[PDB]
């Protein structure tokens, strides 16, 4: 049906937002200032005091850094550790040790990371452990690991006064020391000028050599109304969602009269999936808005408490991923509906001899790219950043083929070898295309 497909594509090509870019950009620009100059955990305190507190409490009571963005609740600082297993190598060079990779801290210590006293429980201290279930469940995927959702937790916020109080109380007592793995700073913000709820996480994680990597993760979600997006949008969507139900009924009465062979035809698997996805999208959208509302119900009871909006943002990311698939299926279905009602065969069956050119030319490709990717990764993977791993090298070699990446540093590093490798590539491709010419000109002559 023409109307059904045109409505689907205008409902996927629409629903864009031009403010989710500028919000992310403003926030990232302000909070990432001088963040990457933190190497050791000794520097976190000048940075926190200089470019984290002036932005969290920005000269309008409640908003971050210019007004325009309300702060929702407390600000959390969390940290996961490795057990203080006293190493002090010193005279330990013969039979050098292997530090364990099975270690995390889960014990309750007491002030100064010492043994605790005879109240063995799990109190809410900055020294006791907090379960992920007790906490807002959210495993964070950092850059060189996937840290847990628990740890040692402090909350300092809603003034500028209490923030500095606890920031000078943490440093005086050595809360952050050398047994500290990743550290996280978490808060949430709401912008009511362009209804958008953003969650900000700042990750300071530990590498092998004593030094830290810094990163930001922003995630936003638009809680408008899902229905009050204005006129001329509700009408198109309502007719589209009525036609989706029509087609669902069509495919239902088609399956009942079949009981089988429904999965043998492409024209059936391509519409049922579209129907299911179109239903699930609106289902999950209503569900996300409900989750947000009932989590605001908690905020209105007692603010001055940390709140995690992670469930709503996660189901919203599900809604987003279910749109790439809707778009893909719609494109395939449109292409088929067009190639049927107009004899528009793409290939003149020169791209096949009944099964071989399919898997007799996607093996040449894989072997050649694996060869060049492995070699480039072993040769240049210790200095150049585009060849750190095998898959980075795969993408970079494909880019070399396309032209977006240049051979300027691999020639500046290893001229004698890098030149011969490029030469091999070029000779191979030239021979391939010359064969493609001569076989073609010899076919149409014999």
């Amino acid at each position: 049906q023409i109307l059904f497909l045109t409505l689907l594509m205008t409902t996927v090509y629409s629903a864009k937002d031009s403010s989710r870019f500028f919000l992310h950009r403003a926030i990232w620009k302000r909070f990432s200032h001088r963040f990457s100059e933190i190497k050791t955990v000794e520097d976190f305190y000048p940075w926190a005091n200089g470019t984290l507190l002036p932005n969290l409490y920005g000269d309008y009571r409640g908003f971050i850094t210019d007004g325009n963005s309300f702060l929702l609740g407390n600000v959390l600082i969390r940290q996961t550790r490795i057990p203080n297993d006293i190493f002090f190598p010193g005279s330990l060079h013969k039979q050098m040790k292997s530090p364990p990779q099975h270690q995390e801290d889960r014990e309750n210590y007491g002030a100064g990371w010492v043994p605790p006293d005879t109240n063995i429980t799990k109190v809410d201290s900055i020294w006791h452990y907090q379960n992920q279930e007790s906490l807002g469940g959210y495993p964070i995927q950092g850059e060189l690991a996937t840290y847990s959702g628990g740890g040692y937790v402090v909350r300092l916020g809603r003034n500028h006064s209490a923030a500095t109080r606890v920031l000078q109380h943490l440093e005086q007592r050595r809360w952050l020391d050398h047994c500290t793995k990743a550290l996280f700073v978490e808060f949430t913000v709401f912008n009511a000028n362009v209804n958008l709820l953003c969650a900000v996480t700042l990750i300071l994680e530990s590498s092998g050599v004593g030094t830290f990597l810094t990163s930001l993760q922003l995630d936003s979600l638009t809680s408008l109304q899902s229905s009050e997006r204005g006129f001329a949008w509700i009408v198109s969507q309502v007719v589209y969602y009525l036609l989706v139900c029509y087609y669902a009924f069509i495919q239902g009465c088609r399956l009942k009269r079949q009981r089988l062979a429904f999965f043998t035809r492409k024209r059936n698997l391509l519409d049922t999936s579209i129907v299911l996805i179109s239903f699930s999208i609106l289902g999950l959208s209503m569900q996300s808005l409900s989750l947000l509302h009932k989590k605001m119900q908690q905020y209105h009871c007692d603010r001055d408490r940390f709140i995690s909006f992670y469930e709503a943002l996660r189901v919203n990311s599900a809604v987003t991923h279910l749109r790439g698939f809707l778009l893909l299926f719609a494109t395939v279905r449109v292409w088929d509906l067009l190639r049927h009602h107009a004899q528009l065969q793409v290939i003149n069956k020169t791209l096949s001899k009944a099964w071989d050119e399919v898997l007799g030319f996607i093996l040449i490709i894989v072997v050649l790219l694996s060869s060049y990717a492995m070699t480039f990764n072993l040769l240049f993977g210790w200095s150049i950043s585009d060849y750190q791993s095998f898959f980075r090298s795969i993408v970079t070699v494909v880019g070399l083929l396309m032209g977006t990446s240049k051979h300027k540093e691999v020639i500046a590093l290893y001229p004698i070898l890098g030149s011969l490798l490029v030469l091999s590539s070029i000779i191979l491709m030239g021979l391939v295309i010359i064969n493609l010419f001569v076989s073609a000109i010899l076919i149409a002559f014999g």
């Binding site: 090509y13 864009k16 403010s19 870019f21 409640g62 850094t65 936003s220 290939i347 494909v398 149409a444």
Partner: protein
């Protein structure tokens, strides 16, 4: 063979017309218009203050006042040599000792209403203000602050005889809250101090303009500067600028007095080409509309007419501006309208010349010099259309996908049109992939690799299709 089409009597006449319009359009471009723009933009956009805030790196309102106090009055007002000996010419400011500052600079501001939107139901007793994005119907028109001067009351677009402006987010209207800066530098410093103490820039502010103009008489040129700062409803600031070097007065020396003869012969040539094109349509009533070389003649005629009209418009407008500049100084003179329209006039002249050259390509002919591919795509015009649609539907699907996956973290994907042009540029070998790999660690590489393989597939198919055609029959 390049045998000549329609009689030499026509080719020679068109050659004369072509060289005439070339003399016209190249006699009015100056060799020192790039360096003028260069030095002026480098003086106003790059000079930093103490704390190092240049206009290109403004990021807050405090930064804005930092720039507006220090390196804006220091650059606008020049009253001493470098050895602190005073220049002779008094009461005027000559920037770089050569460029006379015309009139008075102007600061303008466009505000939004305290209640342009309604806050969400949950945050209705925590958030008390809603400031929508800019729109001409949501625009504060009430006094604020001390509520007295011209910087605190609203002036319509017809009181402030002014025009629109296409910024980086929207198009802004021509009215609002303004202030004209006075003669000396200390008076301007005090005026700006008064604008900053009583809080002129609050969260209702959406855009700020700084307008001024300069004239150089050594070369005969104007430079009109407009510095814009936009404050989105999402927070942040975005600076931009328009610096237009133009020639509004254009009859000073003898080389210019020669150009009036070329202009007269241009008008008589247009008269000839409009009487000639009618005797070509008086015969062929509607068969005339079949030749493609006839739409081009109409377009060239139309564009020449429009240029001839803008000539006299510009003359009258510049006379009025100079009069009002001389009679009542210390007032802002709207040079930006004339500058914008002169720039558009120059663009139109460039396009018209580009089409004149193609018409010369029409007058002479070559038997078959590049008709070789046209022949093959006139013969094999069915499968190439299938390939065109199959390439375009996937191309747009990929553009939308790239807008979905990235486009909150990367700018090149923040808009559908930006996605289209970013893909077009990928095809040519110009792309920073590390951005989209930081943005998404799994689907970044997938997007990139599948897109590149799709492009290569389509090109391979097209080549195998067209080279398998030059060998069909023998």
């Amino acid at each position: 063979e390049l045998y000549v089409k329609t009689t030499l009597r026509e080719l020679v006449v068109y050659i004369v017309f072509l060289v005439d319009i070339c003399l016209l359009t190249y006699g009015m471009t100056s060799s020192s218009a790039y360096y003028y723009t260069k030095v002026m933009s480098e003086l106003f956009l790059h000079t930093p203050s103490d704390s190092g805030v240049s206009f290109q790196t403004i990021s807050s309102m405090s930064d804005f006042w930092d720039f507006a106090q220090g390196p804006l009055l220091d650059s606008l007002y020049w009253t001493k040599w470098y050895n602190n000996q005073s220049l002779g010419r008094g009461s005027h400011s000559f920037i770089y000792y050569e460029n006379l500052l015309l009139g008075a600079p102007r600061l303008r501001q466009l505000r939004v209403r305290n209640d342009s939107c309604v806050v969400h139901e949950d945050f209705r007793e925590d958030i008390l203000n809603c400031y929508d994005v800019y729109s001409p119907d949501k625009e504060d028109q009430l006094p604020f602050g001390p509520q007295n001067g011209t910087a605190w009351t609203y002036h319509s677009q017809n009181e402030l005889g002014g025009s629109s402006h296409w910024g980086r987010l929207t198009s802004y209207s021509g009215g609002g809250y303004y202030l004209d800066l006075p003669g000396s530098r200390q008076a301007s410093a005090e005026a700006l101090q008064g604008l900053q103490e009583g809080l002129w820039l609050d969260r209702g502010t959406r855009v700020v303009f700084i307008d001024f103009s300069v004239y150089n008489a050594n070369i005969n040129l104007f430079c009109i500067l407009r510095l814009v700062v936009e404050f989105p409803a999402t927070g942040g600031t975005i600076p931009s600028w328009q610096i237009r070097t133009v020639k509004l007065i254009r009859y000073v020396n003898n080389w210019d007095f020669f150009i009036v003869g070329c202009e007269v012969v241009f008008c008589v040539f247009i008269f000839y080409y409009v009487v000639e094109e009618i005797l070509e349509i008086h015969l062929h009533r509607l068969r005339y509309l079949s030749s493609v070389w006839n739409i081009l003649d109409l377009v060239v005629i139309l564009l020449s007419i429009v240029a001839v009209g803008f000539h006299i418009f510009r003359t009258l407008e510049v006379n009025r501006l100079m009069g009002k500049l001389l009679q009542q100084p210390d007032t802002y003179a709207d040079f930006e309208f004339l500058a914008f329209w002169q720039t558009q006039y120059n663009n139109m002249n460039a396009v018209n010349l580009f089409f004149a050259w193609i018409k010369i390509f029409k007058y002479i002919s070559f038997n078959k010099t590049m008709t070789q591919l046209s022949s093959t795509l006139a013969r094999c015009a069915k499968d190439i259309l299938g390939f065109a649609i199959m390439f375009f539907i996937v191309f747009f699907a990929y553009a939308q996908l790239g807008y979905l996956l990235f486009g909150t973290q990367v700018e090149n994907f923040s808009t559908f049109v930006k996605c289209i042009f970013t893909q077009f540029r990928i095809i040519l070998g110009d792309f920073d992939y590390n951005a989209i790999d930081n943005a998404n660690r799994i689907l970044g590489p997938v997007y990139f690799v599948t897109y590149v393989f799709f492009v290569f597939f389509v090109l391979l198919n097209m080549f195998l299709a067209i080279i398998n055609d030059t060998y069909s029959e023998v």
